[PDB]
Symmetry: D2
Subunit: 164 residues, 4 copies
């Protein structure tokens, strides 16, 4: 994976924190927001290893960080002998680690394969968590929920044809 596990866990923490605020548990929300902030602010983390260059951020000098990924499949689902043969060869090539050859066989049988990457703008997200922490410290719990929502709103999905 080129997925940043720290960014993935941080955003999962934000989701649970926002729900905690509406279930009368600000203390859990505060602890989770602190965990998320610390996950994104480590000096040892090599964020460049997870960055998506070429995706321009709203903040200058910021970068989008890959924090999750999924596979997207498109096809007709019609079984033909030719498509079954292509899939058999694709499976063969994938077993041998020939990922690029496997994808070529799938694509000629009408299968589209995308990698969906979930992208987090690093400094923009840190700034939103910092705003949330200040509000939590002042017990402005609804407002903290909105700042956390703003962090979630910065996450985008980018889909790219795999091995094309």
């Amino acid at each position: 994976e080129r997925i940043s596990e720290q960014g993935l866990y941080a955003m999962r923490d934000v989701q649970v924190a926002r729900l905690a605020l509406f279930h009368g548990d600000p203390e859990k929300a505060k602890e989770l927001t602190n965990e998320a902030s610390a996950l994104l602010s480590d000096d040892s983390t090599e964020w460049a290893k997870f960055a998506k260059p070429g995706k321009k951020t709203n903040l200058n000098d910021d970068q989008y960080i890959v924090i999750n990924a999924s596979v997207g499949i498109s096809e007709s689902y019609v079984a033909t002998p030719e498509k079954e043969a292509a899939i058999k060869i694709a499976n063969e090539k994938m077993a041998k680690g020939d990922k690029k050859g496997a994808m070529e066989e799938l694509r000629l049988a009408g299968v589209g394969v995308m990698e969906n990457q979930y992208l987090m703008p690093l400094k923009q997200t840190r700034n939103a968590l910092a705003d949330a922490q200040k509000l939590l410290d002042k017990k402005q719990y609804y407002e903290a929920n909105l700042a956390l929502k703003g962090a979630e709103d910065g996450i985008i999905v980018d889909s790219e044809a795999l091995f094309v």
Copy 2:
């Protein structure tokens, strides 16, 4: 209003497994699929305790299991003295754990709050994972990816107004 962390962990395994079939190790895909299947097949988990009762399933005698939850906020984002006064009171009741009274105060402020629950049909999902395990055993990797996709496709969202 409790989430099955076991079901959520299983479905997260499924997502990683599908991508590994195209982009990582098929051996890791098999291991993740075995783990997801074992988590869902474990009846030491008290599944009924996490079920959503009034949601009819596709299989007879199945149940939807709550495996994730999030908050959805609707409002205009326009500040007024009346609204800020009501939000201040909402925050005070949140601090005292009065989650119902806090929600009544937010509705005075013009805020709509939903809880989104992600629902997993347990036996239907078990069946899809079992199909994927059979395919992976035969090195039918693309087909296994579709069986896992079918598992993901059974997850639905149900949204309900929080504490009305």
Copy 3:
């Protein structure tokens, strides 16, 4: 049934938010007025499109069905039993026997959901009215947020089809 007035109103909202940020507030104002008019028709039988039993944030509001889609879940494994079930289901669909067709698929391990998009009617009218006041005051960014609030009221409700 699906409310095409609600469907068109929320489509107008989406286009209006884009128009504001492409430097066309006039187009956004026209579209927001159209959406307001679609949701305030005196002679729309809204109860015909309502989703009762879905509790709203506002007291005595109602959710309106404004869109729908089909969701299919299966494992894509071909067997003789499954192909035979699909053939029977297709024959039932050809005859208009929609309920039997879906039951035949479910018995073969195919899940068919109806995904309904639900609009809270009075809540959405209120959001549009807030956006109109901001547009009148030339508060265009703020109006874009108010329209976003109207969009965030739309929820999805999925039910097994003809179950």
Copy 4:
């Protein structure tokens, strides 16, 4: 530039999938015929709506922009600086200086994305042709899956607006 032709075609596909499972195959066939005709109509200047630099699965294909929406990210904390930037951005929107307006927001911590929905033209034409063959053979469940495959080719591409 959004392709209204492509958007209409994909909306037809959604309704067709619903019609198949609500016992109306003739309506689904009519809707699928219309979607195929719209996408095959080369009097539409498809290249004018294409998203350059986005690689498709098929060798000589192109992604067509068929829909777009706005996404706003901010922390909702009112500060004198942000409130002044919103005032300036609103003035630039009113003058049609759309790029300066988004830059003003960006520099005050308000991020605006444009989300574009992208349709791979030849790939989508191919998926509809597959569905047509199935509909002609009365293979209605299979046609529903082939139409689902057409929808699954639509992707979202988000970019900072006028950055």
